[PDB]
Amino acid sequence: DIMVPSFVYNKLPVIHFLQEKRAEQKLRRVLDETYTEWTEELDQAHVTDAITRSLNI
């Protein structure tokens, strides 16, 4: 009725602070894993060159 309740009350602020940091840590890691991915596609000039060769030019 008295003792355990008081010590639970004492624990609340630190646990709240640590869990807020843990949540921020998760969000930070989520952002850090994001990285714009640029793709490379076959240049059309080689297509235009193969087109020309096929013509027997």
């Binding site: 076959l42 080689h46 297509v47 193969a50 087109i51 096929s54």
Partner: protein, 37 residues
């Protein structure tokens, strides 16, 4: 260009009928093949 040439150079047009659609279909097949490779 010294020397009388034997022939006059007319345009090389001999394929009088070459539909643009066929040419742009061959270009497209070649394009697809190269992209797939």
């Amino acid at each position: 260009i010294s020397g009388v040439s034997p022939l006059l150079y007319f345009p090389p047009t001999t394929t009088s009928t070459t539909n643009r659609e066929d040419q742009i279909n061959k270009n497209t097949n070649i394009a697809i093949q190269m992209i797939k490779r």
